[PDB]
């Protein structure tokens, strides 16, 4: 038997376009995520000036957009075809969550433009359980207990069983 | 021409010649330094003590 209150789902789909090319090439990156998500993103202002990379303190490096629920499933759905329904073992984190990276934004029903060009966006999947939203309230918060967590070994047999997507070695 | 800078050597001997006197232990402390909202009211409490003397 199974307990469907231990059903595994996606809490949020965290997407970012890290360009490090502020002003012209960063404000046009917002058009990609609004096409992909259907909601307005928040810009990623830097922490300090690194000089080898070519960033500056509080300069807009990236732009991020977290999507939840119904829309979040569909955006993660089409990205897996572009990573041909297979992920490396070491893509999966210790704390249940995972992610991967498709190299070009053009593959997600997004047509080319001589000004838009060839962006790179990066997926990260936050795998959740009913009652993972205890530890972020203003009332009585607490750690979820080790019995209730999602492990890397279980986060495989979510993906390996749900999508029937293979997990390649090498 | 340097000198001795400081001492407290003979001072304890001097302090007990007339005694280290504990301060003037008197009844009725003054109402000096009492919060002047409370002291207004206590001054009014004494002002109208005549009012309830035929009761008294």
């Amino acid at each position: 038997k199974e307990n469907p209150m231990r059903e595994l789902r996606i809490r949020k789909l965290c997407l970012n376009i890290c360009v490090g090319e502020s002003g012209d090439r960063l404000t046009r990156a917002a058009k990609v995520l609004e096409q992909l998500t259907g909601q307005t993103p928040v810009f990623s202002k830097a922490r300090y000036t690194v000089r080898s990379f070519g960033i500056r303190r509080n300069e807009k490096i990236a732009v991020h957009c977290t999507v939840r629920g119904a829309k979040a499933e569909e955006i993660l759905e089409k990205g897996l075809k572009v990573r041909e329904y297979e992920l490396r073992k070491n893509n999966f984190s210790d704390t249940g969550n995972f992610g991967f990276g498709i190299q070009e934004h053009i593959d997600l029903g997004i047509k080319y433009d001589p000004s838009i060009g060839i962006y790179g966006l990066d997926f990260y999947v936050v795998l959740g359980r009913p009652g993972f939203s205890i530890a972020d309230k203003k009332r009585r918060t607490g750690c979820i207990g080790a019995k209730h967590r999602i492990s890397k070994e279980e986060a495989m047999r979510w993906f390996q069983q749900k999508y029937d997507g293979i997990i390649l070695p090498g | 021409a340097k000198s001795k800078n400081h001492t407290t050597h003979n001072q304890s001997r001097k302090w007990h010649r007339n005694g280290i006197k504990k301060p003037r232990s008197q009844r009725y402390e003054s109402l000096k330094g009492v919060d002047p909202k409370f002291l207004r009211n206590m001054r009014f409490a004494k002002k109208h003590n005549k009012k309830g003397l035929k009761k008294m």
Partner: protein, 293 residues
């Protein structure tokens, strides 16, 4: 490989916060100002009106500071409204408002200021606040304790605050957090407040769903359907309750059933038990080793 953050020595160092701060129930910063009295009062009880909104209940208390543990002087819960008229919808702004009115009129009964300080009997949503009469015993003044609830405009806590203010409690407040306050233009409506107080915020959603589809309505309001609550019955269902609170505010307690005395709980394993388990394990480890060879 990296260092253990929580060493054998981390816990020698580690100071724990207060139990009510650890459990995440009390803000001791918020409590440090609410509860303590000006020390030139010399034991005047500093009354505060507590409102704690649960998932299925709204707990409204009046308490004052004691070193033993702050003593509750009066308390009315939301589950007492089914003896006045509010059968279901216990945890909405309308049922929050009735509980504030319940706590108010109960304390005023338990003192003898019941007939004095009527307050708002015609429920409006004006800024009414209780003003004491010369000769008649002075109005009960207390202060709202929101707890750990964010006080945005139209928090249910201000429902039970408006309940107390309309009962005969002289509480200082502003109508910024009462609903019907627009943040842009910054006026206050009597009517738009009353829509939430009498429960047309709920009744219009009952109409909106019943107009739209009969699958997502029969899910959303099971007990409003089950126990005959229509949007048209809604407004008068609370009006009947508001005079019903002012009929019988005095509380009759529920009698206890006799304690049969079975322990639902595992009592502590004593020393001679705790020491013998490991003595049996040190038998079980050594008796199950010799069999191998």
């Amino acid at each position: 490989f990296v260092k253990v953050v929580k060493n054998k020595a981390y816990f020698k160092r580690y100071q724990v916060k207060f139990r009510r701060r650890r459990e995440g129930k009390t803000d001791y910063y918020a409590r440090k100002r609410l509860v303590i009295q000006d020390k030139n009062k010399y034991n005047t009880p500093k009354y505060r009106m507590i409102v704690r909104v649960t998932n299925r209940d709204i707990i409204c208390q009046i308490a004052y500071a004691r070193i033993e543990g702050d003593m509750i002087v009066c308390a009315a819960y939301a589950h007492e409204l089914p003896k006045y008229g509010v059968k279901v919808g216990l945890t909405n702004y309308a049922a929050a408002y009735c509980t504030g009115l319940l706590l108010a009129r109960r304390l005023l009964n338990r003192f003898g200021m019941d007939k004095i300080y009527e307050g708002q009997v015609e429920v409006t949503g004006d800024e009414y606040n209780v003003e004491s009469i010369d000769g008649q015993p002075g109005a009960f003044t207390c202060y709202l304790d929101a707890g750990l609830a964010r006080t945005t405009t139209g928090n249910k806590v201000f429902g039970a605050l408006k309940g107390a203010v309309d009962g005969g409690l002289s509480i200082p407040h502003s109508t910024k957090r009462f609903p019907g306050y627009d943040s842009e233009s910054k006026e206050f409506n009597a009517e738009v407040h009353r829509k939430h107080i009498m429960g047309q915020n709920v009744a219009d959603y009952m109409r909106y769903l019943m107009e739209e589809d009969e699958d997502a309505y029969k899910k959303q309001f099971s007990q409003y359907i089950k126990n005959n609550v229509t949007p048209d019955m809604m407004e008068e269902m609370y009006k009947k309750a508001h005079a019903a609170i002012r009929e019988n505010p005095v509380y009759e307690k529920k009698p206890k059933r006799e304690v049969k005395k079975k322990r639902w709980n595992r009592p502590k394993m004593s020393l001679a038990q705790k020491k013998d388990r490991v003595a049996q394990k040190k038998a079980s480890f050594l008796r199950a080793q010799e069999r191998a060879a």
